[PDB]
């Protein structure tokens, strides 16, 4: 049950709904939101490393 694989499945289904009814602005917004959610997921991974670097910086300043 991989997370990024699941998010991609949700993205595919959102694209599918939009593809069938492209004049529905709500389906467009939902696809956009899902796509952003995927990018936020990647930003969160680099954010953890950034936190660790900050922790190390604090450790050095004793
Ligand atoms: Na979600």
């Amino acid at each position: 049950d991989d997370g990024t694989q699941t998010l991609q499945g949700e993205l595919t289904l959102a694209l599918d709904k939009l593809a069938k009814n492209p004049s529905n602005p709500q389906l467009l917004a939902e696809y956009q939101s899902k796509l952003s959610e995927y990018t936020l997921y990647r930003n969160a991974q680099s954010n953890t490393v950034k936190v660790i670097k900050d922790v190390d910086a604090a450790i050095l300043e004793h």
Side-chain angles (χ1 to χ4, degrees):
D1 231 3
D2 188 314
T4 68
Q5 261 168 233
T6 285
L7 260 156
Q8 182 185 84
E10 292 177 4
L11 188 68
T12 300
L13 291 197
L15 185 64
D16 184 71
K17 292 188 180 50
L18 175 57
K20 288 167 190 165
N21 286 279
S23 58
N24 182 332
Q26 172 64 15
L27 297 183
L28 178 62
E30 280 175 11
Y31 177 72
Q32 286 169 341
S33 167
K34 186 60 60 173
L35 179 64
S36 300
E37 185 168 347
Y38 162 72
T39 65
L40 288 158
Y41 179 112
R42 300 298 188 185
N43 298 32
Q45 294 184 313
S46 94
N47 276 343
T48 299
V49 167
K50 275 172 191 186
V51 170
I52 297 294
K53 291 321 196 175
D54 192 45
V55 167
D56 186 62
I59 284 176
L60 297 191
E61 90 176 346
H62 321 111

